[PDB]
Amino acid sequence: ANPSRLIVAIEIVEDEIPLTKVDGLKARIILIEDNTSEVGTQRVLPGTLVSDKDGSQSLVYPLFEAPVSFFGKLGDSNGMRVWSTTTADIEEFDEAAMAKFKTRQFRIQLIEKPESPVIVKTADQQDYLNITFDKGVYSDMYNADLYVGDVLVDSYSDDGVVSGLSPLYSPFSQFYVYHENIDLVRQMIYDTEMRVNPAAAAHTTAPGEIDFLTFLAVDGDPYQGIQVLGPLDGGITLGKDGNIYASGGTDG
Structure with a gap:
């Protein structure tokens, strides 16, 4: 009767950390x-x-929302991972793209149980998808549009034409981004941090560059103005190993 669904949100409050x-x-x-x-x-x-x-009192900001493509409690076996890029890692990322558009580059990968979980490769057979949560970003490095809303479903799908195989469909039918909420959240963290640690303006030059999921700054360093709450404290760790699953699937 009802698809499973993933809604990701962030709880924030002002406090002495x-x-x-x-x-x-x-x-x-x-x-x-x-x-x-x-x-x-x-x-x-x-x-x-x-x-x-x-x-x-804390507020809870829906950040994004993704329904599963097919009916059933089995849709609860679908989920994903998400992490920000850093000028500290083994891989690199489109540093000029970020520069130009003053936004942050993220990697999202779809996964399935049984769980390690199993990775759903994209159509073109990559392990993960490079995305921005903002519109209008085009990357010369990957010669693609990066906006999640515009590219994810499409990328985990394959109508089978110039492919010649059985049409392939994405486990998630749409990726909805709460733009206003995200902008509200980033500003908050940008401000806080410019105040707390004003040197951080050197590589974090825009609120659009804030990693509001794993709270790493571009240099690789976790913001000094945030105190993250893990599972010990009612939270969820996102990141390369940070597994989240859709839920609420009903059969009827």
């Missing part, structure tokens, strides 16, 4: 479980976090 206090942010990645609402209609809402500093 440690700076290894100081005034910055307490954040944690969370999943919202809803297969009822129409896709793209999650709201920013107060979470369960409170602030030791001033009694303020």
Whole structure:
């Protein structure tokens, strides 16, 4: 009756964190479980976090949302991984593209259980897809558009034409990005950090360059104005090994 679904969100509050206090942010990645609402209609809402500093309450910002392509509880076997790029790693990434468009480059990969989980290769047979959460970014390195919304489904799909094989379809039928929420979240972290650690403006020159998922700065270094909350603290670790699955699949 109902597809499984993945909704990724971020819970943030203002608090005194440690700076290894100081005034910055307490954040944690969370999943919202809803297969009822129409896709793209999650709201920013107060979470369960409170602030030791001033009694303020956390807010929860839906970031993105992806429905599974097919009915059934088995759709709950679909999920994904996501991580930001860094001028610290083994692989490189499109540094001039980022420069030009002042946005951050991310890698997303689809996965399936049984779990390590199994990696769903893209059509062109790559292990992962290079994306930006912003529109208009075109990469000369990968000669592709990078915007997730425009490219993911399409990339894990293959109508079979010049391919000659059985049409291939993506396990996720659409990737909806909450642009406004993301911009709201990045600004928040950009501001906080420019204040806390103003040298960080050297490579983080725009709010659009903020990694709001794994909270690494471009240089590779985790922002000094964020204190991340892992599973110990009600959170979810994203990243190369950070597995998240769709849910709420119903058979009827």
